[PDB]
Amino acid sequence: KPFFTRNPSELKGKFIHTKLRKSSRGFGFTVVGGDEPDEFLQIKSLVLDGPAALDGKMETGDVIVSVNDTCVLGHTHAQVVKIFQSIPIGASVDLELCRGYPLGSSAYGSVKAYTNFDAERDALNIETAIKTKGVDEVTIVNILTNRSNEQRQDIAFAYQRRTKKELASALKSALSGHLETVILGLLKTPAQYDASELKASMKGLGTDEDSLIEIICSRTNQELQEINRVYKEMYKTDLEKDIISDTSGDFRKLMVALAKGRRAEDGSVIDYELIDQDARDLYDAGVKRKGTDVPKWISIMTERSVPHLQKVFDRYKSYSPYDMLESIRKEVKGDLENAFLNLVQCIQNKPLYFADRLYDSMKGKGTRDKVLIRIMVSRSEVDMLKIRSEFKRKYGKSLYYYIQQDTKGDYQKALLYLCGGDD
């Protein structure tokens, strides 16, 4: 379970004392937690231009320690909410907040929020490192690879206010080589990172379908809405129409369909009839058919929920003498075959898919740094621990070990920090 305590002397981070005047719309913040008995109450969000945000002290993830001089450690959500609502308009509330506990991180990311976070100190330190004679890369890597992505957005903000220069511009000018690529990738938000990588994979008729496939096939609906949004903000065109430009045929069809990000959401009930029905349909459309009905495959694989499809592919083995991946490698070729194999891997076991892509990026002569870097950046706060345990199970040695063999210098150290562990 996450960390709890009823005693303020045992809380870790830093303490904030604020006074809010109750407005006609309350104090302007929502609270989360406090149903499970030993659960902190944390600030989930703030109403822009509302009393809490206008005051400027409260932040998301802050733990509510006490209200009006009464400790509420271990209060239920219902007891606390009642305290706030009883305060009449124009009266004020005193809030003691503990900063340093996380809200809503993935239990499977390798990279965690830094608990003693001081954006200003890091900005100062990275500036001092950038301006060292012969740049201090160690400090830059040491700091940025051990901050969460949203703490990096804060560092970038503080750096810009301290120097009047964007952080990412200052680091592009101070860094070089693969280290530059890692650090610049780390500085983007996930949606910005994926958008720019999608853009770079479509930089012309020389399209890198491998990279377009990796991102489009592996990102969830939520992730894709955000990507479609900031891609149009960043590049003043819709992601869909750049895909239509640089792709064609059934491959374009399947890429357009996935990139929309309107896959069915996880149902509450398992639909055994439709599972068998889909499994039958996939077989009818391929192995037992002359040629292959590609539209039926696109339809089923892009529209059903991921847990439903996991059971479809199992149930498909009842009908086909070849499983879904082996059937794909017999029925299609080229970019379309590649995309299908990538998608089915992501549905069946997304961490194993990334582990195999990481293994492929390093196993031979040299390194496919582009793939190695994008995976370590994009998955580090998502499922890197599952990726590592899948990789170690299959290949015997850790992911850490393979990175050590394939990379060197500060680049290697940055990738091992993103990896996590000491091995």
């Binding site: 309350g26 302007g28 913040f29 929502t30 609270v31 989360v32 109403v47």
Partner: peptide, 6 residues
């Protein structure tokens, strides 16, 4: 799932 606007 515990959320409420205060």
């Amino acid at each position: 799932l515990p959320s409420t606007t205060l």
